[PDB]
Design a binder for this molecule. Structure first.
Ligand code: B12
Ligand code: Z97
Ligand code: 5AD
Lengths: 728, 110
């Protein structure tokens, strides 16, 4: 119901009636290619359908504010701990091109042995529950209607309640999710038997939902000592979750490889990452490539991150990315702020658009060093499999510590992670099914004896109970809150005040945080602290130095700080006032020709100033088609006029630089008088400028306008067209 | 490399053959795991059955907690509730519900 572009999203109105919300859509959506698309002056080889409402790249202003959208579906990561604040950032992000909103879970939700309910406060992520999901997806339904292009809701089916969360996601129309039982074992230490048995069930459910699945390979990048050696392992994990998923019954087009280029500068990164990128995509023809951005070799400089992320988009463009995830360029500096999600989204939309149809003009030298390494990596991958097989399959491989090893396989440093086939979270929670094991629900995986109740229902185990929740949404049990203190409505009230005052925020409504960039003429430690003092003396609470870059050990250091603004401001308490374009100026002079005489006047030899507002170089009136007749310098006032008359000029421009004894105003006045004496004063425009000129003091002398320090041609031209109209 | 002498038996494969191998060995590795999946269940898998049947998360947990107390998992926590309702002539929900509060397990054991 509704949504207006100028009216804030009503979250309070969204938290309402949740017990009767259903999704509008089920499944993942891709972007529609829009072949040979025309937008503004240009034609686009690699664009998809444009949005109905969006915010263009700043510089789009020079091209009619077109906002073309790239082929790959674009992700951003929004999860602040409070979903209700996050929804607003979603709206923001969606207008900047995002159609994939991914919600990292609350710290170690992987360990929760079942669903959670309600809206407790997250920690390093949002606690995923049916309430919070219904809220966000309801909101996104709205937002996607607004932007005009379906949005993909995404989160994590991981840990010990995989099956649980898979069901909830399926029901509540979650469009994408991470699922990789390998993740559970390697990094979360969850019993390998328990989790690979669970995955079948989860993946089967996600299959039912036509959900896009992303895997966990990228976590290998992160754990690895040197990510440039982890590629043969990377190709095995990807391979393992893919065949496994495929076999469970997922579509090859829903199985997505999560693939981050391993290195970043100063390493020769394109050189290292490109051949692996090419190998990966050759081996998994048919599968989806989910390109994600580097976070390992990232620091606190947002600039650094942006450049390296561009090289990440280049990698995707030289090869393929069905999905292109993004990393906020401040990910290494703090928890993502609103503004840096939008930075990410702009960057990705920006580079890709800039790389439009680039493969029509560039191609891979597949036969050369590139080809050779591509084969080499595939072979190291194959060997890796052989050795797994050769030691009793997956489980023994993990036990023997094949995984997370800092060596470049077949090289083995013997420092990998090893898991007990019998240890871990949920050890000995695996039960054998008997001849008569049954489950009367849709999308169940393993042995299900229904024949003991009806040979004819074997393909419809839900018919045993007149449909399961997957067929009868009504049957789903909605739970609203469990904790009366740690919830959203308790949170929405600690801030209802700000819904007509205002203050700056970074993640959560009114949190008062802002960023401070400065440079100090001393070394890094001294400057780090001086920075904090300045920040303090600005009225900032909770001051942190978040970035430190050395300009030069001795000449100075850049510092970046966050802090808190302890006050608010009343919108009502601000006084806010309420412009001819270069095209308007140009058009007016094009239609009505406009002729000027200009001079540096008197005994003045300073010529630069007048010429600075005439020459086309720095935006002088010449640019707009004004006919400038220039007399030179040390021109007499009497002379200037006589020419204005001879040439039937429309305006006189005079430069007045030397200002000794008010000689500059004195000549301004002699010009007005000289024109009056000659009866052209009412038929002419008289403009005068100079270093010591004050526009008011110059009008008082009788001339039409005065210009001083900082005059540019646009100003003088705006004055010539406006004043001329005013006289007709 | 080392690597060089280990890839010896790979040198003469074609790119198609090397890929085909990779994948058939991939399938060979996960097939056993897939099996474990067919032949076994877990607390989460059972709770997830209950969720799909009309029960809540809190309820599902209680029903499975008592299903494990009786080594009954082997039958299927969803199954139990079913037989239990088709036996007493009651609603899938009332049965399941009853079981969540330690009722009808006497019956369940037979
Ligand atoms: C470089 C310079 C000179 C150059 C001039 C070279 C040339 N061809 O232009 C030479 C030629 C090196 C020079 C000579 C002298 N000059 Co001298 N000159 C300067 C200096 C440093 C340059 C100013 C300048 O060009 N600014 C850059 C331009 C871009 O700015 P602008 O002129 O102000 O123009 C802007 C605005 O005024 C406006 N504008 C200006 N005119 C007009 C007209 C119109 C219609 C509009 C719309 C806008 C507009 O638009 C521009 C937008 O940014 C200044 C000191 C200073 N910083 O002001 C003195 C200075 C103006 N000159 C000075 C002096 C004393 C001299 C000399 C007498 C020194 C000597 N010989 O002993 C001689 C005199 C020569 C003479 N017969 O006039 C003094 C003047 C003191 C005063 N108040 O009268 C100054 C202020 C230096 C000083 N403080 O002593 N100098
Ligand atoms: C396959 C999988 N399951 C669960 C979890 C996390 O869930 P918990 O923390 O164990 O509760 C992860 C973690 N990925 C880290 C960031 C995501 C990244 N930035 C991204 O590109 O996807 C995971 O990879
Ligand atoms: C620490 C927490 O325990 C849960 N939780 C489960 N049951 C209750 C209950 N009866 N009262 C309060 N919290 C409960 C939450 O979902 C949570 O935030």
């Amino acid at each position: 119901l509704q949504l207006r572009v100028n009216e804030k999203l009503d979250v309070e109105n969204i938290l309402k009636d949740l017990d009767k919300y259903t999704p509008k859509r089920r499944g993942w959506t891709w972007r529609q290619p829009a072949e040979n698309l025309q937008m503004g002056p240009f034609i686009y080889k690699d664009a998809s359908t444009p949005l109905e409402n969006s915010v263009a790249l700043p510089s789009a202003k020079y091209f009619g504010d077109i906002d073309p959208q790239p082929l790959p579906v674009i992700t951003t990561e929004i999860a602040s701990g409070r979903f209700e604040d996050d929804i607003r950032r979603m709206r923001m992000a969606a207008w900047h091109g995002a159609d994939h909103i991914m919600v990292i879970r609350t710290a170690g939700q992987s360990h929760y042995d079942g669903l959670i309910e309600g809206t407790p406060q997250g920690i390093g992520g949002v606690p995923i529950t049916r309430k919070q999901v219904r809220a966000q997806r309801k909101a996104l339904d709205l937002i996607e209607e607004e932007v005009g292009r379906p949005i993909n809701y995404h989160s994590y089916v991981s840990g010990v309640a995989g099956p649980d969360i898979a069901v909830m996601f399926a029901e509540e129309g979650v469009n994408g999710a991470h699922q990789d039982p390998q993740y559970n074992v390697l990094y979360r230490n969850i019993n390998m038997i328990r989790s690979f048995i669970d995955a079948c069930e989860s993946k089967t459910i996600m299959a039912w939902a036509d959900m896009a699945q992303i895997d966990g390979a990228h976590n290998a990048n992160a754990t690895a000592r040197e990510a440039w050696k982890v590629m043969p392992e990377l190709m095995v994990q990807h391979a393992l979750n893919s065949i496994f998923s495929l076999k469970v019954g997922m579509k090859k087009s829903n199985i997505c490889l999560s693939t981050v280029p391993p290195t970043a500068p100063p390493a020769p990164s394109m050189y290292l990452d490109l051949p692996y990128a090419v190998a990966l995509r050759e081996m998994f023809e048919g599968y989806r490539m989910r390109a994600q951005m580097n976070t390992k070799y990232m620091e606190a400089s947002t600039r650094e991150a942006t450049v390296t992320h561009v090289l990440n988009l280049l990698i995707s463009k030289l090869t393929r990315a069905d999905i292109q995830s993004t990393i906020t360029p401040d990910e290494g500096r703090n928890v993502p702020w609103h503004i840096y999600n939008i930075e990410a989204c702009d960057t990705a939309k920006q580079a890709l658009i800039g790389m439009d149809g680039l493969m029509d003009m560039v191609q891979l030298k597949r036969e050369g060093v590139l080809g050779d390494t591509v084969r080499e990596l595939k072979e190291r991958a194959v060997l890796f499999m052989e050795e797994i097989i050769e030691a009793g399959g997956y489980f023994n491989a993990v036990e023997q510590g094949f995984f997370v090893d800092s060596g470049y396989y077949p090289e083995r440093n013997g420092d990998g992670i090893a898991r007990q086939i019998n240890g871990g979270i949920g050890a000995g929670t695996v039960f054998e099914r008997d001849e008569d094991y049954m489950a009367p629900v849709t999308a169940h995986f393993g042995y299900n004896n229904v024949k003991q109740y009806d040979e004819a229902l074997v393909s419809e185990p839900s018919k045993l109970i007149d449909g399961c929740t997957l067929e009868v949404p009504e049957k789903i049990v909605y739970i609203d809150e469990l904790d009366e203190n740690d919830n959203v409505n308790v949170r929405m009230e600690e801030t209802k005040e700000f819904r007509s005052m205002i203050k700056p925020e970074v993640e959560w409504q009114a949190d008062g945080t802002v960023l401070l960039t400065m440079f100090l003429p001393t070394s890094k430690r001294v400057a780090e602290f001086a920075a904090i003092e300045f920040a303090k003396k600005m009225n900032l609470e909770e001051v942190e130095v978040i970035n430190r870059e050395v300009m030069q050990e001795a000449e100075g250091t850049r510092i970046e700080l966050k802090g808190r603004v302890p006050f608010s401001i009343d919108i009502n308490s601000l006084v806010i006032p309420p412009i001819l374009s270069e095209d308007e100026i140009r058009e007016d002079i094009e239609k009505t020709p406009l002729k000027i005489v200009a001079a540096t006047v008197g005994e003045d030899e300073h010529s630069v100033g007048l010429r600075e507002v005439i020459d086309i170089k720095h935006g002088g009136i010449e640019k707009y088609g004004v006919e400038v007749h220039y007399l030179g310098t040390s021109v007499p006032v009497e002379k200037l006029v006589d020419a204005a008359i001879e040439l039937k000029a429309d305006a006189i421009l005079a430069s007045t630089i030397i200002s000794h004894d008010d000689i500059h105003y004195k000549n301004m006045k002699r010009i007005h008088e000289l024109a009056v004496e000659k009866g052209i004063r009412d038929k002419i425009m008289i403009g005068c400028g100079g270093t010591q000129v004050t526009p008011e003091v110059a009008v008082k002398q009788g001339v039409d306008a005065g210009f001083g320090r900082g005059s540019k041609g646009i100003h003088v031209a705006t004055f010539l067209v406006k004043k001329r109209r005013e006289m007709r | 490399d080392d690597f060089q002498q280990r890839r010896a038996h790979l040198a003469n494969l074609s790119d198609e053959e090397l890929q085909t191998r990779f994948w058939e060995m991939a399938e060979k590795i996960v097939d056993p795991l897939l099996d474990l999946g067919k032949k076994n269940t877990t607390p989460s898998i059972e709770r997830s059955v209950l969720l799909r049947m009309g029960f809540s998360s809190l309820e599902a947990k209680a029903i499975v907690d008592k299903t494990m107390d009786r080594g009954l998992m082997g039958k299927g926590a969803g199954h139990i509730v079913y037989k239990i309702a088709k036996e007493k002539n009651i609603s899938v929900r009332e049965a399941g519900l009853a079981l969540s509060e330690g009722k009808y397990w006497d019956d369940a054991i037979q």
